[PDB]
């Protein structure tokens, strides 16, 4: 029912500088008892969520002054100062004025100089071929920022609908991402074509790069 909107949905920050997130609600979160029912939670990669701020502006025990929550009514702000890698994660707002709802989360990451992916292509192993399936893998390694696009080609025909991919979390040491993509064909379909090609477009690349192999 009450709707929570958070912007931006992802927020890169230079180590050391400040970050601000907005949370906007479809209606006031101020109760007649005079409390402002807005809480911020942080979820760090692969951990439970944790409470940062309750009631607009109260820090939960252990949360440092660097985190500052404010605003009221239908407008709230979480400011994070002196951002370090340890702050990376998704920040959600949540109202408890009525049946609670969350906003959709703001991914906070560390900003670094743009970096072009190193690309690799792997044929399916002779080993897996014995059983009717062929998986062709593409690795886009150590890049920044996160947007990247993989296009598969099979004898130069554009593939669609037969690939899946996922991306690592940001390396907190080097602040990059890696991406893995998998083209699955059937052994028969694999054996009747020759050129298997991984085409990659990023922002660190002057033009799209291709890695390929024959067999």
């Amino acid at each position: 029912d009450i709707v929570m909107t958070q912007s931006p949905l992802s927020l890169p920050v230079t180590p050391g500088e400040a970050a601000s997130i907005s949370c906007r609600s479809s209606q006031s979160l101020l109760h007649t008892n005079g409390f402002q029912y807005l809480d911020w939670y942080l979820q760090k990669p692969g951990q439970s969520p944790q409470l940062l701020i309750y009631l607009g502006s109260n820090r939960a025990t252990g949360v440092p002054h660097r985190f500052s929550g404010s605003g009221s009514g239908t407008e709230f702000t979480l400011k994070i100062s002196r951002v370090e890698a340890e702050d990376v994660g998704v920040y959600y707002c949540m109202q408890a004025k009525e049946s609670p709802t969350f906003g959709q989360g703001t991914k906070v990451e560390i900003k670094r100089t743009v970096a072009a992916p190193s690309v690799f292509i792997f044929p399916p192993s002779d080993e897996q071929l014995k059983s009717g399936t062929a998986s062709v893998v593409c690795l886009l390694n150590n890049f920044y920022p996160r947007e990247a696009k993989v296009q598969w080609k099979v004898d130069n025909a554009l593939q669609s609908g037969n690939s899946q991919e996922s991306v690592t979390e940001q390396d907190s040491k080097d602040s990059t991402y890696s991406l893995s993509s998998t083209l699955t064909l059937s052994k028969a379909d694999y054996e009747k074509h020759k050129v298997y090609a991984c085409e990659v477009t990023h922002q660190g690349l002057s033009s799209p790069v291709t890695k390929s192999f024959n067999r």
Binding site: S135, L139, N141, Q164, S166, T168, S178, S180, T182, T184
Partner: peptide, 17 residues
């Protein structure tokens, strides 16, 4: 090292690299 998050295939089995 990079271990990627698993994807769920159309057969309902996971795959990971």
């Amino acid at each position: 090292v990079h271990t990627f998050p698993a994807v769920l295939q159309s057969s309902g089995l996971y795959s990971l690299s």
